[PDB]
Amino acid sequence: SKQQIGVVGMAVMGRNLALNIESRGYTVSIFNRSREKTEEVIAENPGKKLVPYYTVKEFVESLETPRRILLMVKAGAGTDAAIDSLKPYLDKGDIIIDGGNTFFQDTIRRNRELSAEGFNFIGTGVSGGEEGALKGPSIMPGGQKEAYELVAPILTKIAAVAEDGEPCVTYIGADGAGHYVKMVHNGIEYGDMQLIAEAYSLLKGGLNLTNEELAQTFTEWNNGELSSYLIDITKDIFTKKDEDGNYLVDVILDEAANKGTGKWTSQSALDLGEPLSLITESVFARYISSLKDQRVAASKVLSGPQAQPAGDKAEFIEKVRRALYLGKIVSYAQGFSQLRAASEEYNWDLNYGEIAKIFRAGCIIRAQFLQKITDAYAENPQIANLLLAPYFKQIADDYQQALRDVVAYAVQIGIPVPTFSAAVAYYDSYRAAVLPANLIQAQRDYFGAHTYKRIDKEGVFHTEWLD
Amino acid sequence: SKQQIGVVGMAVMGRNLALNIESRGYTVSIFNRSREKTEEVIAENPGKKLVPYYTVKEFVESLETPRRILLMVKAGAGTDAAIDSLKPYLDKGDIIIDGGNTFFQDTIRRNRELSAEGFNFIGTGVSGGEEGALKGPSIMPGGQKEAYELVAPILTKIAAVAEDGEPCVTYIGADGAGHYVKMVHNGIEYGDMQLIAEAYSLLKGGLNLTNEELAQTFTEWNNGELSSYLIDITKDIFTKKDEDGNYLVDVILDEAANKGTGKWTSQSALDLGEPLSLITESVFARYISSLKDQRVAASKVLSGPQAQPAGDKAEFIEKVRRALYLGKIVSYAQGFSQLRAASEEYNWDLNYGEIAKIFRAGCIIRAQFLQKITDAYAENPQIANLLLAPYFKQIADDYQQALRDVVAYAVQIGIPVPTFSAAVAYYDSYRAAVLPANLIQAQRDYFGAHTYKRIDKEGVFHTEWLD
Numbered sequence: 001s002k003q004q005i006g007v008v009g010m011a012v013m014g015r016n017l018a019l020n021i022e023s024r025g026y027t028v029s030i031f032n033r034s035r036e037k038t039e040e041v042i043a044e045n046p047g048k049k050l051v052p053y054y055t056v057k058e059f060v061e062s063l064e065t066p067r068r069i070l071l072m073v074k075a076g077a078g079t080d081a082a083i084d085s086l087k088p089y090l091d092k093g094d095i096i097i098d099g100g101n102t103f104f105q106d107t108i109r110r111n112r113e114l115s116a117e118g119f120n121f122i123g124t125g126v127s128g129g130e131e132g133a134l135k136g137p138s139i140m141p142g143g144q145k146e147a148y149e150l151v152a153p154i155l156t157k158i159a160a161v162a163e164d165g166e167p168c169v170t171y172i173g174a175d176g177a178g179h180y181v182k183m184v185h186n187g188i189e190y191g192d193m194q195l196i197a198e199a200y201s202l203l204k205g206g207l208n209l210t211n212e213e214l215a216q217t218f219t220e221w222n223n224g225e226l227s228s229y230l231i232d233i234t235k236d237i238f239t240k241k242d243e244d245g246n247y248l249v250d251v252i253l254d255e256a257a258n259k260g261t262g263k264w265t266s267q268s269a270l271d272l273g274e275p276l277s278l279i280t281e282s283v284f285a286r287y288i289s290s291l292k293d294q295r296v297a298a299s300k301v302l303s304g305p306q307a308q309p310a311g312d313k314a315e316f317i318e319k320v321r322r323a324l325y326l327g328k329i330v331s332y333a334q335g336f337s338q339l340r341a342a343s344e345e346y347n348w349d350l351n352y353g354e355i356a357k358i359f360r361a362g363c364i365i366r367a368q369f370l371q372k373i374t375d376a377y378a379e380n381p382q383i384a385n386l387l388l389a390p391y392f393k394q395i396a397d398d399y400q401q402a403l404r405d406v407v408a409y410a411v412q413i414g415i416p417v418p419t420f421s422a423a424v425a426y427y428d429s430y431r432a433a434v435l436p437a438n439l440i441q442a443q444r445d446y447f448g449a450h451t452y453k454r455i456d457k458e459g460v461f462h463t464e465w466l467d
Numbered sequence: 468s469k470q471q472i473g474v475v476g477m478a479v480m481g482r483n484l485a486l487n488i489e490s491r492g493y494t495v496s497i498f499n500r501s502r503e504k505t506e507e508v509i510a511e512n513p514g515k516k517l518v519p520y521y522t523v524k525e526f527v528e529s530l531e532t533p534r535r536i537l538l539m540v541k542a543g544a545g546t547d548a549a550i551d552s553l554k555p556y557l558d559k560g561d562i563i564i565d566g567g568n569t570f571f572q573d574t575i576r577r578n579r580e581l582s583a584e585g586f587n588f589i590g591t592g593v594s595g596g597e598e599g600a601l602k603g604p605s606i607m608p609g610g611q612k613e614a615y616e617l618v619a620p621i622l623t624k625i626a627a628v629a630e631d632g633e634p635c636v637t638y639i640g641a642d643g644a645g646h647y648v649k650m651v652h653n654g655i656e657y658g659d660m661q662l663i664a665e666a667y668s669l670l671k672g673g674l675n676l677t678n679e680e681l682a683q684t685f686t687e688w689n690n691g692e693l694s695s696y697l698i699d700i701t702k703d704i705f706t707k708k709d710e711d712g713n714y715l716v717d718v719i720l721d722e723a724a725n726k727g728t729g730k731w732t733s734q735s736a737l738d739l740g741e742p743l744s745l746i747t748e749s750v751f752a753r754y755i756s757s758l759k760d761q762r763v764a765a766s767k768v769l770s771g772p773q774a775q776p777a778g779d780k781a782e783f784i785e786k787v788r789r790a791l792y793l794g795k796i797v798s799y800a801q802g803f804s805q806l807r808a809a810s811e812e813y814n815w816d817l818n819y820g821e822i823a824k825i826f827r828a829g830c831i832i833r834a835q836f837l838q839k840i841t842d843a844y845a846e847n848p849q850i851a852n853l854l855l856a857p858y859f860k861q862i863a864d865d866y867q868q869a870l871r872d873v874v875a876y877a878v879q880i881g882i883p884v885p886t887f888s889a890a891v892a893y894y895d896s897y898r899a900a901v902l903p904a905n906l907i908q909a910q911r912d913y914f915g916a917h918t919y920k921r922i923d924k925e926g927v928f929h930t931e932w933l934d
């Protein structure tokens with residue numbers, strides 16, 4: 001009469017996680033505030049050991065104790081409400097897993113409150129989209145280690161598994177560390193999508209490639225070092241047609257929506273002093289695509305440059321391919337530097353190689369690329385930035401000229417390349433022993449008496465630039 | 468008897484503001500938490516109609532009702548501390564004016580709390596530095612309009628004055644609007660400083676100009692449309708020599724510090740959906756300059772390109788000049804669009820032309836340029852973005868090729884130009900009727916069933932991409 005695990009939230013990720021758990025042999029109670037979505041999941045999944053509940057009291061009473069309840073609810077108010085609804089019905093010792101894309105500070109507060117109340121809480125990221133939620137996602141749990149150990153067996157059962165046999169779940173760290181890692185996974189995902197979008201813009205605008213030629217190009221890139229789930233699905237998207245014979249990609253409205261995690265990643269870079277330019281420009285690229293009416297009006301009044309020969313087709317395709325791969329390297333180097341800054345600030349002692357390992361399969365950014373990062377940290381766990389690791393440093397040596405060529409060409413012909421150009425600016429600033437910030441410090445001392453330090457003597461200084 | 472106004476906080480900013488007020492013919496009451504700073508100001512200004520108090524009670528009683536108290540203490544808990552110490556002595560209707568560098572949400576909270584208690588609260592920005600606070604700053608107040616009008620006689624007399632005779636102070640809007648506009652002013656200032664730093668980088672690294680040639684160039688640029696206070700002080704900086712007599716700008720550590728406002732501007736753009744790329748990359752350029760140890764390490768490991776010829780000296784200098792001016796236009800277009808988005812979110816009904824007018828003098832970004840923005844809003848107050856105004860469209864028509872040439876050259880030779888790059892990517896995205904966000908929306912629907920809209924049919928769609 002009782003089920004083993006309960007799942008609250010029957011939208012895409014939640015219903016698929018419930019089906020994932022059930023597929024491992026577990027009996028599962030489900031509940032959704034919009035009671036009609038619960039009905040639908042039951043109707044669509046005859047033969048599965050899912051049992052629907054239509055009041056929170058009955059859902060909670062239906063579970064074996066100590067209870068294991070997974071919440072997959074909308075971030076913010078919604079998750080706070082679901083948790084507050086469950087609370088009066090729970091027993092001390094019950095286990096609450098918030099698997100939603102919750103902002104990490106909310107998880108730090110909740111972990112403190114619920115732990116004090118006697119519950120075992122885990123705030124965990126879950127990554128993999130609809131298919132990954134169903135078949136095996138990457139899971140990144142944070143909270144007290146004792147609470148993790150109570151749910152590790154089930155999380156291991158439903159998680160994706162890498163080619164080497166290792167489950168794509170591991171204890172991330174205390175309190176909000178798991179949701180913070182999920183937030184950065186999503187920021188990295190926004191950057192990978194924007195990098196691919198710029199490659200698409202360059203190949204379509206510079207070479208006038210057709211959608212079949214774009215599909216072909218992405219298929220070839222997917223057979224090499226750029227292989228990844230995002231490139232693999234992009235190759236498919238370019239040949240998808242609607243019932244009318246229209247290529248779907250050309251009738252989809254170009255307003256990219258966002259549900260908060262990329263924005264939060266950039267707001268955290270700003271709080272932590274990390275120069276996270278690529279992912280941030282990817283968020284702003286979504287924002288400006290979301291000003292479609294303004295862009296359509298401006299396109300009718302603002303001038304641009306004339307067309308420019310891209311040159312040999314094969315030569316251009318290889319330069320864009322190299323630019324995309326080096327752009328990814330820069331984005332990940334920025335993202336992982338931010339994980340170390342956050343780890344230091346929030347006292348998480350994150351294990352960067354272990355994080356990269358659980359992103360090898362399951363998650364949206366999965367790609368053999370994550371193994372190159374795992375290996376870099378295995379050789380030097382304290383590495384300050386991935387650009388210094390031999391593998392990455394040598395790709396930058398080999399591919400930076402292609403990236404520079406692509407950015408110069410795009411700027412001359414008018415194709416926007418925010419992330420390829422942020423990648424060049426970051427590479428050339430990170431390797432610069434001296435930047436023009438000496439002038440900025442002089443200006444600040446002149447107009448605001450902010451003082452400055454010198455390269456040849458100790459102390460703080462203030463000058464009368466006037467007299 | 469009694470003073471029309473008192474100033475709390477006798478550090479440089481508050482004491483200088485009190486002196487500005489006294490110089491206008493007013494008798495000013497002053498008070499500081501540490502009596503010694505007060506005694507100092509008193510001892511230092513013999514003939515000044517400054518009246519010291521050493522108890523908060525006496526200070527408050529010295530003032531004519533409705534009381535006007537200008538609070539210039541450390542932002543944060545110290546401002547709440549100064550507020551909390553004044554309350555018991557205040558009468559309904561009195562006015563507290565916070566001129567600190569306060570985050571606007573704190574001003575919203577205080578304005579609400581104090582209003583409930585019957586007290587007015589004006590959060591005001593003050594721009595111009597130590598000299599400006601003394602001779603004439605730009606003042607940006609928000610709060611109750613009636614309280615502002617009561618104290619406006621005094622503020623209009625201490626403010627800087629524009630070329631048309633108008634004082635650089637105006638009612639900005641309700642609650643936190645003044646502190647929000649001061650924040651944006653500071654984000655714009657960060658952008659102007661970074662654009663100037665890139666121009667310096669390029670002229671020094673590309674043409675090998677000496678500091679004397681840099682001063683000469685900036686002096687020539689300041690005679691024309693670029694005329695601005697920041698360019699004026701930059702040419703002074705380039706010829707300032709040391710004790711020994713070496714150029715001071717060359718011995719300053721290239722680590723740019725910050726006091727929060729730039730970071731705050733970018734975090735607000737992220738909250739509001741505004742693609743504020745230029746100012747945000749200016750903040751990240753300060754962050755990477757502050758990772759000096761990492762940059763020095765990386766400079767010993769990472770490779771870069773071989774320097775290419777810049778060509779004709781005069782021609783290159785003119786291209787950099789044009790790039791700098793068009794970059795400023797783009798940065799201000801982004802900043803004013805953010806002001807419009809904030810005005811809509813926080814219900815301020817901001818008057819953009821009036822905000823541009825009080826930035827014509829007193830403030831750090833003062834420049835003749837602000838009159839072109841003022842003119843644009845006089846003709847079209849609700850214009851969506853400054854790039855659409857005839858004057859700016861024409862500059863972009865004429866100068867974009869130089870900006871493209873400068874970015875392409877910098878990328879080929881390895882000098883980082885994050886804001887010139889962001890300027891070109893924004894211009895080319897804002898004018899693009901169609902962006903590659905159609906592919907981003909397809910990917911999100913493919914992996915997460917996030918749905919999409921179409922350009923040829925109304926409604927919301929989802930595709931089963933796997934079948």
Ligand SMILES: Nc1ncnc2c1ncn2[C@@H]1O[C@H](COP(=O)(O)OP(=O)(O)O)[C@@H](O)[C@H]1OP(=O)(O)O
Nearest residue numbers: 009010011032033034037072073074077078081082
């Ligand atoms: N206050 C609340 N209490 C409980 N569940 C809530 C909630 N607010 C949102 N959710 C759940 O959070 C899940 C995701 O909501 P959403 O609006 O973010 O969905 P989507 O992004 O897929 O359109 C849904 O299961 C939603 O329940 P409903 O289907 O009833 O909307």
Ligand SMILES: O=C(O)[C@H](O)[C@@H](O)[C@H](O)[C@H](O)COP(=O)(O)O
Nearest residue numbers: 127128129186258259260364915
């Ligand atoms: O890791 C994942 O499985 C995805 O990221 C998932 O969490 C979800 O699809 C997000 O909503 C995508 O982020 P944006 O909706 O904000 O595009």
Ligand SMILES: O=C(O)[C@H](O)[C@@H](O)[C@H](O)[C@H](O)COP(=O)(O)O
Nearest residue numbers: 448594595596653725726727831
């Ligand atoms: O308008 C002004 O008078 C300045 O902008 C002023 O507010 C101060 O000098 C800031 O501290 C500079 O900002 P940073 O210190 O963050 O560079």
